[PDB]
Amino acid sequence: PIHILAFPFPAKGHINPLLHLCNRLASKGFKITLITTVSTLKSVKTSKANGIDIESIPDGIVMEMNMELYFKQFKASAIENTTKLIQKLKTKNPLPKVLIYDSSMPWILEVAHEQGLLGASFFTQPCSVSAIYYHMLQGTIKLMVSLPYLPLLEIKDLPGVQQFEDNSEAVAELLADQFSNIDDVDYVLFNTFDALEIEVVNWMGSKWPILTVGPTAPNYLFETNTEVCMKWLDQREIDTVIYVSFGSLASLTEEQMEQVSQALIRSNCYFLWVVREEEENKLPKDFKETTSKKKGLVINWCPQLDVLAHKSVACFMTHCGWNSTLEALCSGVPMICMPQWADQTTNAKLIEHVWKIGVGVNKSGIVKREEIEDCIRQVIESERGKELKRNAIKWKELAKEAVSEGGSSCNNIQEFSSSLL
Numbered sequence: 001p002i003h004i005l006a007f008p009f010p011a012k013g014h015i016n017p018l019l020h021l022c023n024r025l026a027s028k029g030f031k032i033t034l035i036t037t038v039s040t041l042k043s044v045k046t047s048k049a050n051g052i053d054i055e056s057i058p059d060g061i062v063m064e065m066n067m068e069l070y071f072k073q074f075k076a077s078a079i080e081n082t083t084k085l086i087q088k089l090k091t092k093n094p095l096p097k098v099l100i101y102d103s104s105m106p107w108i109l110e111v112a113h114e115q116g117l118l119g120a121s122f123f124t125q126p127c128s129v130s131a132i133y134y135h136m137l138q139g140t141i142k143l144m145v146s147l148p149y150l151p152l153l154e155i156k157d158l159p160g161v162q163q164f165e166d167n168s169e170a171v172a173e174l175l176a177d178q179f180s181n182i183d184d185v186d187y188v189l190f191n192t193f194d195a196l197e198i199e200v201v202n203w204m205g206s207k208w209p210i211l212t213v214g215p216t217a218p219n220y221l222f223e224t225n226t227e228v229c230m231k232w233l234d235q236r237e238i239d240t241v242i243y244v245s246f247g248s249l250a251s252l253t254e255e256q257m258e259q260v261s262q263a264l265i266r267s268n269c270y271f272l273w274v275v276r277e278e279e280e281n282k283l284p285k286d287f288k289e290t291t292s293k294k295k296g297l298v299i300n301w302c303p304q305l306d307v308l309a310h311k312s313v314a315c316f317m318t319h320c321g322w323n324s325t326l327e328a329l330c331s332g333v334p335m336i337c338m339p340q341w342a343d344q345t346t347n348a349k350l351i352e353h354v355w356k357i358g359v360g361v362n363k364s365g366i367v368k369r370e371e372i373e374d375c376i377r378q379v380i381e382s383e384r385g386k387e388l389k390r391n392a393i394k395w396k397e398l399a400k401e402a403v404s405e406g407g408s409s410c411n412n413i414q415e416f417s418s419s420l421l
C-alpha cells in the first residue's frame with residue numbers, strides 16, 4: 001500500500017476534515033498514519049474502527065495566553081518531533097510517501113521535503129476566505145471592502161482578528177503565512193467544491209493547480225454521546241428541532257448564554273444545544289436539569305454529522321465555523337448565523353448573502369433573546385424560512401454531485417490518488 005501521513009493543526013475543526021479525507025483515502029487502499037499531539041490524544045476515545053494508525057507527538061507548549069510566543073514554540077517543537085516520528089516510520093514497511101499537513105502549518109513542507117516525502121497543504125477554510133489571506137500576504141489588504149470575486153464586504157464581514165486583542169497581530173501573520181510557500185507545495189487541497197464558489201476557484205486555479213476535494217465529511221474520534229442524541233431526535237417530528245452549537249473553541253459569556261437560554265425557552269421549539277462540558281457552569285442555574293427538560297436536550301458534544309442529517313432538524317444556530325457551515329449546506333439545513341471571530345464573520349456573510357441559506361443576528365455587544373427569537377421565527381415559520389430551506393436543499397444536491405462519480409471533488413480526489421501512483 002502507499003503510506004500517507006496526516007498532520008492536522010491540533011483543534012477539532014482541523015482534525016475532523018482531515019480525518020474525513022483520510023477515511024476516504026483509506027477506502028481507496030491507502031495506509032494512513034495520523035499525527036496528533038499528546039493533548040489531542042487525551043480526548044480521543046474511539047479509534048479502533050478507523051484502522052488508521054495514530055502516532056502522538058509532544059504538545060510542544062494555552063496558546064491564547066501569548067499567541068506569538070507559544071505558536072512559535074509549537075512550530076519548533078512540531079518540526080523537531082515530526083522529524084523524529086518520520087525517522088522512526090522510515091524503519092517500517094510501507095515507507096511513508098506523502099505528508100498531508102494543515103495549511104496553517106506551512107513550514108511543515110520543509111519537513112516533508114527534507115524527509116523525501118511529497119507535501120500536500122490541506123486548507124480547512126473555503127477558497128473565498130482563503131483568498132483574503134493571500135491578499136493580506138500580497139499586501140493588498142491589512143487587518144466597504146472590494147476583493148476580486150468576493151461580494152462587497154463591510155468591515156464586520158472581514159475575518160475577525162481584532163477580537164484577539166494583543167494576539168491580533170500574530171493571528172493575522174499566521175493566516176497570511178498559509179500562502180508563503182504555495183508555489184513549492186506538491187499538492188494544494190481545499191475542503192470545498194467548485195459549484196460553491198466557481199469564480200474564486202477559477203481565479204485560484206489560474207495561479208496554482210489546486211484540488212478541491214470537499215466536503216471531505218461523508219466518523220468520530222471523540223465522545224459524541226451518539227445513543228442519547230439520536231434516540232432523542234428519533235422522538236421528534238420533521239422540521240421541529242433547532243440545533244444549537246458554537247463549535248469546539250468559541251466561549252460565550254454567561255450574559256450571552258442567558259439570552260440564548262431564554263430565547264430557546266421562549267421560542268417554544270424543541271432544541272438540541274451543544275454546551276461543552278467546561279462551558280456548562282455558565283448556563284442559568286436550573287437550565288440543564290429542569291428548564292430545558294420539556295423541550296431541549298443539552299449535551300456536551302453530539303454526532304454533528306448524524307444530527308445535521310436527521311429529518312427532525314429544522315435549522316442550525318451556529319457560530320459559522322467552516323466545517324459547521326459546509327456540513328449544514330451539504331445536509332440541506334438552513335442556519336441562524338452567530339459568528340464570534342476569525343473566519344466566522346466572513347462565513348456568515350457568505351451564508352446569508354451569497355448562498356442564501358441563513359440569516360444573521362444583529363448585536364446591540366450582546367445578541368439579545370428577542371433578536372434570536374426573531375431569527376428563529378424567520379426560519380421556522382416565515383416564508384423567508386421556506387426559501388432558505390429550498391436554497392439549502394439545492395446546495396445539498398450540488399454537494400451530492402460533487403462527491404459522487406463524475407463530480408468535481410470525486411475527480412480531484414481521484415487525480416490526487418492517481419498522482420501518488
Ligand SMILES: C[C@]12CC[C@H](O)C[C@@]1(O)CC[C@H]1[C@@H]2CC[C@]2(C)[C@@H](C3=CC(=O)OC3)CC[C@]12O
Pocket residue numbers: 009011063064065067103104164167171175249250342
Ligand atoms: C485565538 C484562539 C481563540 C479561541 C481560544 O480561546 C484561544 C485560541 O488561541 C485557540 C487557537 C485558535 C483560536 C482562534 C482561531 C485560530 C486562528 C485557529 C485557526 C487556524 C487557522 O488556520 O484557521 C483558524 C486555530 C488557532 C487559533 O489561533
Ligand SMILES: O=c1ccn([C@@H]2O[C@H](COP(=O)(O)OP(=O)(O)O)[C@@H](O)[C@H]2O)c(=O)[nH]1
Pocket residue numbers: 011012013014016017245246247248249250274300301302303304305320321322323324325327
Ligand atoms: O457537538 C459537536 C459540535 C461540533 N462538532 C464538530 O466539530 C467541528 C467544528 O468545526 P468548525 O469549523 O465548525 O468550528 P470550530 O470548532 O473550529 O470553531 C466540526 O467537525 C463539527 O462537525 C461535533 O462533532 N459535535
